[PDB]
Coordinates of C-alpha atoms in Angstrom, one line a residue:
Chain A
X1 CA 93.0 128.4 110.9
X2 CA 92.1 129.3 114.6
X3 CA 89.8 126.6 115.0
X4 CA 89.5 123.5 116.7
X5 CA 89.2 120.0 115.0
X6 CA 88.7 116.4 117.2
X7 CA 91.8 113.9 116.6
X8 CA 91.5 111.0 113.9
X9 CA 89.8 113.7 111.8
X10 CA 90.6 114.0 108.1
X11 CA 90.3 117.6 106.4
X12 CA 91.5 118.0 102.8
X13 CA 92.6 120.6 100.8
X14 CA 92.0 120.6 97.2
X15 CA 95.4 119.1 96.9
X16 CA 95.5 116.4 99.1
X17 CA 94.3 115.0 102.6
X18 CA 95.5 115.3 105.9
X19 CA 94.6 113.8 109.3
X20 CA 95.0 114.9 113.4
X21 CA 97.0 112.7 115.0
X22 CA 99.1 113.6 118.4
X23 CA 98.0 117.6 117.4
X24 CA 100.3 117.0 114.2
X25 CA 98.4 117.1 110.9
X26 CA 100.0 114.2 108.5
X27 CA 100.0 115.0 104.9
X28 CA 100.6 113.6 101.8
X29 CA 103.3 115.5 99.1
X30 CA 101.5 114.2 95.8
X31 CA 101.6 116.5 93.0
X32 CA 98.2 118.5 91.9
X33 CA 97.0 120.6 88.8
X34 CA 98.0 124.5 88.6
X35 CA 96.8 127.0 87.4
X36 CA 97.9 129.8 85.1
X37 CA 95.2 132.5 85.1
X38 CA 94.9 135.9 83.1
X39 CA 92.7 138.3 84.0
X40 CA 91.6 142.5 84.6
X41 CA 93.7 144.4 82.4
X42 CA 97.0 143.0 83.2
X43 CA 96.9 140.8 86.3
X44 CA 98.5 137.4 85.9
X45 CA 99.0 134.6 88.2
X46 CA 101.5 131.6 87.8
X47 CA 101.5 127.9 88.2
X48 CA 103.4 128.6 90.7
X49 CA 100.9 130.7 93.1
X50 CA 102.6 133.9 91.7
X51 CA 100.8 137.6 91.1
X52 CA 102.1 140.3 89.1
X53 CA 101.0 143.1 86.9
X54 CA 103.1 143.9 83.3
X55 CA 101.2 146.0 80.8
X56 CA 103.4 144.9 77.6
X57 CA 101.4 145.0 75.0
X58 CA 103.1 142.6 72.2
X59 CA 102.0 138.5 71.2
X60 CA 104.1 137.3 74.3
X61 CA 104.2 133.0 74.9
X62 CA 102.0 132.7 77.7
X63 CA 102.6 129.0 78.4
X64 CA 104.1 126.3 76.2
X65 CA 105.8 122.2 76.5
X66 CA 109.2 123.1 76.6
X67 CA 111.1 119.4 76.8
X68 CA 108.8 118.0 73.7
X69 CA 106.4 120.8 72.5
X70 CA 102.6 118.5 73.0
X71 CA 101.5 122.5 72.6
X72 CA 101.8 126.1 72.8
X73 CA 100.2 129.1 74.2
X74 CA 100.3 133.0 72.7
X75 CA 98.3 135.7 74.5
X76 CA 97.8 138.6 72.3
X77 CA 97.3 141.7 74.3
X78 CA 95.9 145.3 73.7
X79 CA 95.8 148.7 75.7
X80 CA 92.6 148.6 76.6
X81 CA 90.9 151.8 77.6
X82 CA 91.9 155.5 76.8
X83 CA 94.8 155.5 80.1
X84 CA 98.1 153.8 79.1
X85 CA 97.8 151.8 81.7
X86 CA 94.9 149.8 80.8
X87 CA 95.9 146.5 78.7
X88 CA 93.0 144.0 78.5
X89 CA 93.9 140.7 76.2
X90 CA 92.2 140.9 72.9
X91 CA 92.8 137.3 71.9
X92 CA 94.8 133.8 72.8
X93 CA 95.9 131.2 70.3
X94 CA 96.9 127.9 70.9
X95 CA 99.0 125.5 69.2
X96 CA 99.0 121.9 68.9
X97 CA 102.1 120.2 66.7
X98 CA 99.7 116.6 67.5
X99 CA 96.7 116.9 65.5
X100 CA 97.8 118.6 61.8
X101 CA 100.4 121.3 63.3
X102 CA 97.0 123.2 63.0
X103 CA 96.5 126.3 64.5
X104 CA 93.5 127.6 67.2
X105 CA 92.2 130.8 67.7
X106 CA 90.1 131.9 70.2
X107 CA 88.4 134.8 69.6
X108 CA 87.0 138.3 71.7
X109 CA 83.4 136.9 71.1
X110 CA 82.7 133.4 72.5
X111 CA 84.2 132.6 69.0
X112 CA 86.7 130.5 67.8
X113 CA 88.7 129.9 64.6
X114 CA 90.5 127.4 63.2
X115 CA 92.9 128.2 61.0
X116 CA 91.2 130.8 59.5
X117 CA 87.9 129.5 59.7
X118 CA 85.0 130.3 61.9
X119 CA 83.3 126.8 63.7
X120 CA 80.2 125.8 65.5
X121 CA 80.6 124.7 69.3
X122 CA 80.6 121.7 70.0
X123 CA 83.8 120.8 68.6
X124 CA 85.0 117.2 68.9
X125 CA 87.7 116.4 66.9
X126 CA 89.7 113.2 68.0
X127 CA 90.9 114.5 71.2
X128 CA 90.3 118.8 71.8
X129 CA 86.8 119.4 72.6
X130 CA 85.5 123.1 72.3
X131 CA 82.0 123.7 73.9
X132 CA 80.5 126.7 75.2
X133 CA 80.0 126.0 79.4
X134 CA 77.1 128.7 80.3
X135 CA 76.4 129.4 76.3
X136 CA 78.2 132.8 77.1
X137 CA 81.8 130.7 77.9
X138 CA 83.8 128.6 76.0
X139 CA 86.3 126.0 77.1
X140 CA 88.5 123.8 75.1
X141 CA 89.0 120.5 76.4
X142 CA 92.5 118.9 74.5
X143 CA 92.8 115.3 75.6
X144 CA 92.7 115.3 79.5
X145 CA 95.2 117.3 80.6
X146 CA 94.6 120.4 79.0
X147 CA 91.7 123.2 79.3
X148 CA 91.1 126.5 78.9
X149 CA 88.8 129.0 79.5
X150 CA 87.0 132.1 77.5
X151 CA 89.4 134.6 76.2
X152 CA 86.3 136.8 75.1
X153 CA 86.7 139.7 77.5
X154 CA 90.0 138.4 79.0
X155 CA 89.9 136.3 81.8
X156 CA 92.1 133.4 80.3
X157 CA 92.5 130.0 82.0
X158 CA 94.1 127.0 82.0
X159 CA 94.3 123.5 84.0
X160 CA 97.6 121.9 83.2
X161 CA 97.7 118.1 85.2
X162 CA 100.8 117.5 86.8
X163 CA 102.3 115.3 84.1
X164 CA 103.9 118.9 82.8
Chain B
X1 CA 66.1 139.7 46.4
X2 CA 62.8 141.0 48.3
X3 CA 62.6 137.8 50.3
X4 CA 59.7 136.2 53.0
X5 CA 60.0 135.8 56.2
X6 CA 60.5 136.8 59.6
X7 CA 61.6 139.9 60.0
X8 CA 61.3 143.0 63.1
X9 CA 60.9 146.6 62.5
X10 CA 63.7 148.3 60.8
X11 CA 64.5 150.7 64.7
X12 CA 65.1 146.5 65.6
X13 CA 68.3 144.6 63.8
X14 CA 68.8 140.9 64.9
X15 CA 70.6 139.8 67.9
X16 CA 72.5 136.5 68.4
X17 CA 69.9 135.2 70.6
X18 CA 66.8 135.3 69.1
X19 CA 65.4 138.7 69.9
X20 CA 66.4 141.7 67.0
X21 CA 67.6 144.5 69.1
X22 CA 68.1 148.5 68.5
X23 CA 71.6 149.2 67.3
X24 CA 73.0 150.4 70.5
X25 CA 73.7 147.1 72.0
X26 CA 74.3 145.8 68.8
X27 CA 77.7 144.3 69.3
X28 CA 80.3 144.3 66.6
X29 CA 82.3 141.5 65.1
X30 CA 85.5 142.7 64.4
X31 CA 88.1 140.0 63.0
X32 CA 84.9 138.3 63.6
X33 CA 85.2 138.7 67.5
X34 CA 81.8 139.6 69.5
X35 CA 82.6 143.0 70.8
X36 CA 79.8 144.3 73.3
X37 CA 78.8 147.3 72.4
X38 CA 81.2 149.6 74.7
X39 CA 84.9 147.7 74.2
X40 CA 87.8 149.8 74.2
X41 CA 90.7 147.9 72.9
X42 CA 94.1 148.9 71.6
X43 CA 97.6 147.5 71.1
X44 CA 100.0 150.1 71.3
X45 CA 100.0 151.0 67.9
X46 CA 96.6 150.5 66.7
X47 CA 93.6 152.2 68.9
X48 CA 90.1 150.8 68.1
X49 CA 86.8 150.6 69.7
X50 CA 83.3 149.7 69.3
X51 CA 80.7 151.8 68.8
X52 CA 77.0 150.8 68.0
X53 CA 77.9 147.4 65.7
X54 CA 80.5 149.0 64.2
X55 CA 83.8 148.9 64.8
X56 CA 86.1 152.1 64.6
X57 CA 90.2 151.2 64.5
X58 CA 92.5 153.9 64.0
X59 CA 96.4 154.1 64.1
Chain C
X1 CA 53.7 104.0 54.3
X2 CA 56.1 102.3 51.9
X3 CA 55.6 105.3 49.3
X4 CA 57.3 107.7 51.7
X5 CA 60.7 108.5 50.3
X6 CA 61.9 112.1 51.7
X7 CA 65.1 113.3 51.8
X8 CA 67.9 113.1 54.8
X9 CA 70.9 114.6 53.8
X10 CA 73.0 115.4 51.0
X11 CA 76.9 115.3 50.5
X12 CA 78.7 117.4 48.3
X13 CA 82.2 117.3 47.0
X14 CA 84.5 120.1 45.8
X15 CA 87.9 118.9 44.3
X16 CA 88.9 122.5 43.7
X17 CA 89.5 123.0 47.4
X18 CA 91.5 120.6 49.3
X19 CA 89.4 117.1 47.9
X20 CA 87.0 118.5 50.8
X21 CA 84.0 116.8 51.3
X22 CA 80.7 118.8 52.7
X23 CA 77.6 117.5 54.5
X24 CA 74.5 119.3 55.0
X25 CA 72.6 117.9 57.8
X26 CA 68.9 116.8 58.4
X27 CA 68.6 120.3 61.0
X28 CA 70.2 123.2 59.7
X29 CA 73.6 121.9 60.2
X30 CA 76.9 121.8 57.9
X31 CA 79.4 119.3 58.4
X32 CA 82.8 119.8 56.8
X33 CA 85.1 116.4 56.8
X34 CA 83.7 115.2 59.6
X35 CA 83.4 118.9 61.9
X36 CA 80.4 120.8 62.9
X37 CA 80.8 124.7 61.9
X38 CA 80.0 128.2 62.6
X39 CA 78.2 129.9 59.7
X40 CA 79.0 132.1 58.0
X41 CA 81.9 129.7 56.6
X42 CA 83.5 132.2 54.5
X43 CA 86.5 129.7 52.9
X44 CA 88.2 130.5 49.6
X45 CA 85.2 130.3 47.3
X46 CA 82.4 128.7 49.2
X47 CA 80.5 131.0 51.4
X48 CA 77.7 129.0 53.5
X49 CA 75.6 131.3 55.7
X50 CA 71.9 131.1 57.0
X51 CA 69.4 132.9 54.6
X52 CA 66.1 133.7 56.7
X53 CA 68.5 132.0 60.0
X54 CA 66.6 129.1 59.5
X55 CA 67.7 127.5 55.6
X56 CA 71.8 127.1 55.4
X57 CA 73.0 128.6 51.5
X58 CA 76.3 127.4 49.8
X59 CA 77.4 129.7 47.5
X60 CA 80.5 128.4 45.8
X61 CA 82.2 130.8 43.5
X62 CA 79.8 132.1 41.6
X63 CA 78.0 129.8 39.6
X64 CA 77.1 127.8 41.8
X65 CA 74.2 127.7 44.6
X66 CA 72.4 125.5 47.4
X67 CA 69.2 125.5 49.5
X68 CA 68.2 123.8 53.3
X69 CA 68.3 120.0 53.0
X70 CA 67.1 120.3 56.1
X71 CA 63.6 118.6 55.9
X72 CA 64.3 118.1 52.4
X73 CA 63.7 121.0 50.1
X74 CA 67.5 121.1 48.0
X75 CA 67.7 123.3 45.2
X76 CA 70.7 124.5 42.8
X77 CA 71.7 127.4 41.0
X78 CA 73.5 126.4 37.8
X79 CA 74.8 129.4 35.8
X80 CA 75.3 128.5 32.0
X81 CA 78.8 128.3 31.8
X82 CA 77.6 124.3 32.7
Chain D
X1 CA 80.7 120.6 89.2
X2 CA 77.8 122.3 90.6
X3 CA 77.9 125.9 88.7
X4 CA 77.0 129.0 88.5
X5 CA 75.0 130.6 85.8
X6 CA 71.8 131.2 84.3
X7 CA 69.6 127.6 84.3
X8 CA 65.9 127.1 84.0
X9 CA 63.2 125.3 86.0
X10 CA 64.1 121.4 85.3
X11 CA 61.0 121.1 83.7
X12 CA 62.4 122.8 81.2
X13 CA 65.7 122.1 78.6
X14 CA 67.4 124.8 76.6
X15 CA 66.4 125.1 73.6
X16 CA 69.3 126.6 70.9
X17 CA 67.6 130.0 70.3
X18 CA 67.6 131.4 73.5
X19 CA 64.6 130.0 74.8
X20 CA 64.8 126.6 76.9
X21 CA 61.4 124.3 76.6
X22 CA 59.8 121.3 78.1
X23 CA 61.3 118.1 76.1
X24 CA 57.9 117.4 74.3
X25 CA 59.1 119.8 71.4
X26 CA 62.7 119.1 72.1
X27 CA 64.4 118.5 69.0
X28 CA 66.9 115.2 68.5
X29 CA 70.7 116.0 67.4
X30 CA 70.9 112.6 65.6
X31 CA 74.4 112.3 64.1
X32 CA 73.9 116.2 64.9
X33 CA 71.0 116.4 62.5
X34 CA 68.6 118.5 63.7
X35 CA 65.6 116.7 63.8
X36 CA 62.1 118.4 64.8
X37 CA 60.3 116.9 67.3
X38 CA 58.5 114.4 65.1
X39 CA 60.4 112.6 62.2
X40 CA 59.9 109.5 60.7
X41 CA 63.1 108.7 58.8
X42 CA 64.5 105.4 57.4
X43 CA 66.6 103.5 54.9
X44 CA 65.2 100.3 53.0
X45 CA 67.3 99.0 56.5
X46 CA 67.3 100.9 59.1
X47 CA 64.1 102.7 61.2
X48 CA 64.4 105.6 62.8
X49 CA 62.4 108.4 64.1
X50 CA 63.1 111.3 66.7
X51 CA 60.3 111.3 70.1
X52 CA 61.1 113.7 72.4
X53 CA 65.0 114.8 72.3
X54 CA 65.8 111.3 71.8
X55 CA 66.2 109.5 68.4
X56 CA 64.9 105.6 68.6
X57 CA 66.4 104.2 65.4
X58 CA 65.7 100.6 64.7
X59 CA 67.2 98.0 62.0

C-alpha cells in the first residue's frame, strides 16, 4: 500500500495472515465469513464483494440454503420517499425449517415478531438468540453461523461462516 | 377506569424510554413497527407515511 | 422469620389455546412456554399489556382478568358465567 | 468487539428504563424475574435473595 514493512514481518488482513519473506508476501487461501449487506435506499452488496443499485419494490429472496434449506431470507421493500426512485426496506423475514418451520419477523421498529406475535429481547430459544446490541439495534444470533443486523430503518446485515 | 398513578401533562404522551414526550416525535407503530416520527415509506402500490404517532397509508 | 410466606410467581394454563402454559414472573415479566415477551401480547383471546407500565394485566377473553405477581399482589376478575 | 455507541461512566450500569445506575439499586434478573434490589425469597428448601444485581440463592 506504498509503504515499507521490515522482512520476517507478519501483517494480516481480516482474512488471513501473511509474512515478508525475499520481498514476496506468503499467504494462506483459507476461507473467511461474507458479508451480504443492505443498505440506503437500494444499495446492496454481495458475498461476493459486489455493489449494485435495483429499486424493485416486491418480497424478493434476499439470501437462502440452497443444497439443504438450514434457512431463508425475504427482504420486503418499499418506495421510500415522494421520488420513484427512493426504495428504503420496510421489513426482513427469516425462515428457519430447524426449529418448528416457524416463521421470524423483524420489524421497522427495533421489533420483532414471531409468528404473529410481538416478543421481548432477549430471546434465547435453543439455538437463535435475538438481543438488542446498543438498545437501539437488534441482532439475531441463530446457532453460530448465522447473524443479522437491524432491519428498523434498513441497513440489513448478515455474517454467513464459510461452511455455506 | 379513573386510575392512580404516574402520569405527565396531557401537551406530554409517553415515550418508550421513560420520558412522555409531545406528540411530534411521537413515533408510530404501524404493523407494530417503530416509525420515527418523519418515515416516508411506500411499496409501489401502497403510499404511507408517518405523521405525529399516527400513521397515514393510502393506495 | 419463619412466618414470612410471600408470593414468587404464578403459572397459569389455558387449554383453549394450544395447551399453552403462561408464567408471570417475580419482576414484571411474562413468560410464555419457556420465552420471554414483548407486551402488549395481543394472541387470539389473551391480551397481556402493562397497566400503569409497571403491573403486567392478562385479559383472556372476556371474563377473565389478572394483576402483577410481581412482588406478590395477584388478583382475578371472574365474570358470573363461573 | 470494542463498539460504538452510547455507554455510561463504569460506575454506572444501565438500568431498563432509560436511565443506567450504580449497582447498589441494580435489580437481579433471577430466572429473569425481576427482582428489586432487596428480596428475601425462599422455598421450605431453597434460600435465596437478590444483593446488588446478583442473586445468592442457597439450599
Amino acid at each position: 500500500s506504498g509503504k515499507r514493512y521490515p522482512p520476517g514481518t507478519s501483517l494480516s488482513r481480516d482474512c488471513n495472515t501473511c509474512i515478508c519473506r525475499n520481498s514476496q508476501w506468503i499467504c494462506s487461501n483459507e476461507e473467511c465469513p461474507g458479508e451480504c449487506l443492505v443498505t440506503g435506499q437500494s444499495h446492496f452488496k454481495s458475498f461476493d464483494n459486489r455493489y449494485f443499485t435495483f429499486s424493485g419494490i416486491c418480497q424478493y429472496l434476499l439470501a437462502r440454503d440452497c443444497q439443504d434449506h438450514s434457512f431463508s431470507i425475504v427482504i420486503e421493500t418499499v418506495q421510500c420517499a415522494d421520488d420513484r426512485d427512493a426504495v428504503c426496506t420496510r421489513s426482513v423475514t427469516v425462515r428457519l425449517p430447524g426449529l418448528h418451520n416457524s416463521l421470524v419477523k423483524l420489524k421497522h421498529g427495533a421489533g420483532v415478531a414471531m409468528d404473529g406475535q410481538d416478543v421481548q429481547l432477549p430471546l434465547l430459544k435453543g439455538d437463535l438468540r435475538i438481543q438488542h446490541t446498543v438498545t437501539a439495534s437488534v441482532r439475531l444470533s441463530y446457532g453460530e453461523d448465522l447473524q443479522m443486523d437491524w432491519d428498523g430503518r434498513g441497513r440489513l446485515l448478515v455474517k454467513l461462516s464459510p461452511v455455506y | 377506569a379513573c386510575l392512580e398513578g404516574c402520569f405527565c401533562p396531557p401537551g406530554l404522551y409517553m415515550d418508550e424510554r421513560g420520558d412522555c414526550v409531545p406528540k411530534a416525535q411521537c413515533p408510530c407503530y404501524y404493523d407494530g413497527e417503530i416509525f420515527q416520527p418523519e418515515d416516508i415509506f411506500s411499496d409501489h402500490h401502497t403510499m404511507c407515511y408517518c405523521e405525529d404517532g399516527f400513521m397515514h397509508c393510502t393506495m
